[PDB]
Design a protein around this ligand. Structure first.
Ligand SMILES: [C][C]N1C2=C([C]=C([C][C]OC3=[C][C]=N([O])C4=[C][C]=[C][C]=C34)[C]=N2)C(=O)N([C])C2=C1N=[C][C]=[C]2
Ligand SMILES: OC[C@H]1O[C@@](CO)(O[C@H]2O[C@H](CO)[C@@H](O)[C@H](O)[C@H]2O)[C@@H](O)[C@@H]1O
Lengths: 554, 407
């Protein structure tokens, strides 16, 4: 059937006209298969023969998908697609199982020949004209145009979905308690009705759909639980990801590792503690997809931790709007974080993980905040509300950090939960210069041409050293100069620099970094008892800064 | 009742901005609001054949419990700038910033009475999303001038003139300026008299169907004294303090012509301890005094360039205090100020207060450089936002030094 629903007016992009691609001569058998297929479609109203006045055309092709016996018509809409207007996106996002409300019953109904059951805007049909060439293209071909949404055309997914929405509207208003999810040509229907009135309401839905041109399977061919969808396995009281099998291999190739990481990332949605950092490291660099990558000991350890997590099957539960949402986060180690979301203590709706930004100076408090933010965004998408957090950081630690930091940071309602390792700041800088401590005036210059550089200092106690660096940058030399001051100073020290860049990194109390230099400086800062860092204007001949800028420039 | 032709003018395409996820309570509020507007004919449900989209949010009205729809037309505004700025531009009165009191009145309701050019409606498309993406999402477009689009005041301009005509001629010295969906009314009257004139103005508007914290209802512009860069006044000065002073004066010497620091550089000779006390020579105590005088005055040489973008930088100072600067040419301050009371809430408030002053002074909103993480701002700004407009914003990392200079 062809639904009676009003058509969606369609147009080509402005300034463009319909496609006019020449039809390539086809073999006799393909021509025969096409004529047979088109005659069947013509009798059902899908296509109509057109006269020679229609100047448009799109290539047609016939394919026997396999060493099978069925021929399939394949229309090449690439040209028409480039000329067709843009459409609004079908879906803004995909539903997550953790956000689905519990139902007593859920049923799946698939629409048969979905696209062919929807009408195409009359004013646009002419542009879909195609031609079945005669043998050896000696005589005029047989011309046709579509009356329904063509397979492969750019507007079909969108027009079909909006058609399905308008068709369901009436039934929704009359049954505000029934839940209907549209997924391509599938319909998932759930309700809180008893198995008896449910099967009844369903039949009523099918009846309503049929009145609009959409056929569906009867209670005999309706699939049974669990439902496989978007890679999930959905059961009546719980959900999980489809069976995940970890490859058992002797030699791992780039291709095998990418597939492994992909499966682990997908599993991490409900299996707590999945790690991929060490596995992703192996994929760093450029390497042939068929190249064998030997596993480092860290990757071996991480792969074994994962196999262990994936040995005993775990599941997630559905959402209950009357209960609250709780999210817990745990530091797992080197920039890795893991979280679980639940309503009833330990019955996870879903889990997840968060990895620290690469190539950036940071500390545990910043990473936690980032993780909280990531979870907050996801919660709003999934449940439309922010959860209450349970974090591994003391209220005082957090308060000390946010009141001092120059950036605005805010965390929704949370409680401290003692689950080591705890988040803490490993050192803090003084707010005032220290008395009885040596003041180091540091500086670093680097000839941009030779790449040569020097880093040194001068103190109020007469000390002064100057080292030489090779293939360094002005930025790196300012950093080295600070590192030399820390290495040669006592437990307490005042450091004056003219490098705003260095001040910036250090004031943020970084605890982690990929830059060996910054990491060395951090190691020293933790050992100190008191460190006060000040900034002075570059070349203003300021006492101290000037007396050291000499020994460094020359 | 007579649509005004609108054109993006060949070159630019309509807006295709993605809709942001919203909490359940805001979605429900938007659905109720949009269902009413549809019945009333202000907007119409649209199909997939409209490829355009503009984000929509729900904020709380001047009231406390009344939800309001806020459409982010920042893209469409930029793409139709030739229309609202060049073709139907609304003049900004320089006299507004000089008045003793300025009151802000919402007049957005008026626009819903004027039909929008049928060929421009598609560009006003917006989407109400659903929780967990369980249903497609409700799409609509406008049939009347929408709030948030700079084209609306531009087109309603001639009607606004007629409406305010008798009030203006009766009160020649009151300045009335329209910016987006708000009206700015300034006078030098005594506060009681000023408030009485406003009530009368609301009555004029009522006859044409207009039921009209950081304080954006009653402003006192001729009292917006700039936040100077301040130089400490100590009994004793440590090396550290002088260095801080040199740093601050050095930064100010790039903005204010005449700033001198040679006398102080003298005090810092050699390699001394940060805590050492250094006696202030009268030759430098003089320089100090002279710099204080230049700093409490307007910046000489800096003027507003109508063709340039306004920039606003904001620094978190701590203890609920925030400093800000507005400029076009980096660090060439047209205005500096401060705002004092959570962190996100305080920032949104400072941003609304700064945008308002900007609208009063120059008749345009500045582009903000915000000291916060992109997602944190995006997730929370609407929880406290109360204005009907939305400025351009960027997310940046504050240079530790700048915060120190404007402390
Ligand atoms: C109808 C919307 N639908 C949905 C499902 C499951 C539950 C949670 C309850 O799950 C149940 C409950 C009872 N049953 O008898 C079930 C039988 C099979 C699968 C789930 C079942 C609630 N809603 C579901 O299966 N699918 C594919 C789904 C949905 N909505 C959006 C995306 C996917
Ligand atoms: O928050 C910035 C973010 O918002 C989007 C739309 O969601 O852009 C809006 O804000 C920008 C900055 O003010 C404007 O330039 C833009 O026109 C406006 O739509 C995203 O594009 C942007 O990343």
């Amino acid at each position: 059937p062809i639904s009676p629903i009003e058509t969606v007016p369609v147009k080509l992009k402005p300034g463009m006209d319909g496609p006019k691609v020449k039809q390539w001569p086809l073999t006799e058998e393909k021509i025969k298969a096409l004529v047979e297929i088109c005659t069947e479609m013509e009798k059902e109203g899908k296509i109509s023969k057109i006269g020679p006045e229609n100047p448009y055309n799109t290539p047609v092709f016939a394919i026997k998908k396999k060493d099978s016996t069925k021929w399939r018509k394949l229309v090449d809409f690439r040209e028409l697609n480039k000329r067709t207007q843009d459409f609004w996106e079908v879906q803004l996002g995909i539903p997550h199982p953790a956000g689905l409300k519990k139902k007593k019953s859920v049923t799946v109904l698939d629409v048969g020949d979905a696209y062919f059951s929807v009408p195409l805007d009359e004013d646009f049909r002419k542009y879909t004209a195609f031609t079945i060439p005669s043998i050896n293209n000696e005589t005029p071909g047989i011309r046709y145009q579509y009356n329904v949404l063509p397979q492969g055309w750019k507007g079909s997914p969108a027009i079909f979905q909006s058609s399905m929405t308008k068709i369901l509207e009436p039934f929704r208003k009359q049954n505000p308690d029934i839940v209907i999810y549209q997924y391509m040509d599938d319909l998932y229907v759930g309700s809180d009705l008893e198995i008896g009135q449910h099967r009844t309401k369903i039949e009523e839905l099918r009846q309503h759909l049929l009145r609009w041109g959409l056929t569906t399977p009867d209670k005999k061919h309706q699939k049974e639980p669990p439902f496989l969808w978007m890679g999930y396995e959905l059961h009546p009281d719980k959900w999980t990801v489809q069976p995940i099998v970890l490859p058992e291999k002797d030699s791992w190739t780039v291709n095998d590792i990418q597939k492994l990481v992909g499966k682990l990332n997908w599993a991490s949605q409900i299996y707590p503690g999945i790690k991929v950092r060490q596995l992703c490291k192996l994929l760093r660099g450029t390497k042939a997809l068929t190249e064998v990558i030997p596993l480092t000991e860290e990757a071996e350890l991480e792969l074994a931790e994962n196999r262990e997590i994936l040995k005993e099957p775990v599941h997630g539960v559905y959402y209950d709007p009357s209960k609250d949402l709780i999210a817990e986060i745990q530091k797992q180690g080197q920039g890795q974080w893991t979280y679980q979301i639940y309503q009833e203590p330990f019955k996870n709706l879903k889990t997840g993980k968060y990895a620290r930004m690469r190539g950036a100076h940071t500390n545990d408090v910043k990473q936690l905040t980032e993780a909280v933010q990531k979870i907050t965004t996801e919660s709003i998408v999934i449940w439309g509300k922010t959860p209450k957090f349970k974090l591994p950081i003391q209220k005082e630690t957090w308060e000390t950090w946010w009141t001092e930091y120059w950036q605005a940071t805010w965390i929704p309602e949370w409680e401290f939960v003692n689950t080591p390792p705890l988040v803490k700041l490993w050192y803090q800088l003084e707010k005032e210069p220290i008395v009885g401590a040596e003041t180091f005036y540091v500086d670093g210059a680097a000839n941009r041409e030779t790449k040569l550089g020097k880093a040194g200092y001068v103190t109020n106690r007469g000390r002064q050293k100057v080292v030489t660096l090779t293939d360094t940058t002005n930025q790196k030399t300012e950093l080295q100069a600070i590192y030399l001051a820390l290495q040669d100073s006592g437990l307490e020290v005042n450091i004056v620099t003219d490098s705003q860049y260095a001040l910036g990194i250090i004031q943020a109390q970084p605890d982690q970094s990929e830059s060996e230099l910054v990491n060395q400086i951090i190691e020293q800062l933790i050992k100190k008892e008191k460190v006060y860092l000040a900034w002075v204007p570059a070349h203003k001949g300021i006492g101290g800064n000037e007396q050291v800028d000499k020994l460094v420039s020359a | 009742i007579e649509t005004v032709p609108v054109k993006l003018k060949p070159g630019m395409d309509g807006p295709k901005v993605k809709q942001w996820p919203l909490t359940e309570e805001k979605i429900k509020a938007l659905v109720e609001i949009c269902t009413e507007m549809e019945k009333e004919g202000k907007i119409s449900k649209i199909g997939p054949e409209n490829p355009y989209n503009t984000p929509v949010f729900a904020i709380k009205k001047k009231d406390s419990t009344k939800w309001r729809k806020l459409v982010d037309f920042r893209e469409l505004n930029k793409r139709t700038q030739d229309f609202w700025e060049v073709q139907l531009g609304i003049p900004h009165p320089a006299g507004l910033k000089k008045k003793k009191s300025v009151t802000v009145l919402d007049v957005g309701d008026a626009y819903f009475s004027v039909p929008l050019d049928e060929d421009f409606r598609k560009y006003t498309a917006f989407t109400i999303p659903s929780i967990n993406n369980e249903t497609p999402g409700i799409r609509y477009q406008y049939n009347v001038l929408p709030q948030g689009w700079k084209g609306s005041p531009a087109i309603f301009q001639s009607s606004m003139t007629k409406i305010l005509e008798p009030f203006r001629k009766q009160n020649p010295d009151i300045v009335i300026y329209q910016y987006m969906d708000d009206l700015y009314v300034g006078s030098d009257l005594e506060i009681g008299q000023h408030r009485t004139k406003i009530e009368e103005l609301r009555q004029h508007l009522l006859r044409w169907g207009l039921t009209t914290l950081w304080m954006g209802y009653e402003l006192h512009p001729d009292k917006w004294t700039v936040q100077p860069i301040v130089l400490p006044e100590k009994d004793s000065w440590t090396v550290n303090d002088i260095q801080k002073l040199v740093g601050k004066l050095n930064w100010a010497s790039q903005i204010y012509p005449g700033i001198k620091v040679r006398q102080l550089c003298k005090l810092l000779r050699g390699t001394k301890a940060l805590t050492e006390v250094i006696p202030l020579t009268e030759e430098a105590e003089l320089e100090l005094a002279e710099n204080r005088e230049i700093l409490k005055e307007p910046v000489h040489g800096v003027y507003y360039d109508p063709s340039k973008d306004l920039i606003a930088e904001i620094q978190k100072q701590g203890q609920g205090q925030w400093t800000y600067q507005i400029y076009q040419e980096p660090f060439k301050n047209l205005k500096t100020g401060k705002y004092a009371r959570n962190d996100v809430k305080q920032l949104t408030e400072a941003v609304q207060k700064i945008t308002t002053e900007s609208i009063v002074i120059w008749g345009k909103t500045p582009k903000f450089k915000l000291p916060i993480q992109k997602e944190t701002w995006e997730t929370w700004w609407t929880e406290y936002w109360q204005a009907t407009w939305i400025p351009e914003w960027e997310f940046v990392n504050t240079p530790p030094l700048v915060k120190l200079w404007y402390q």
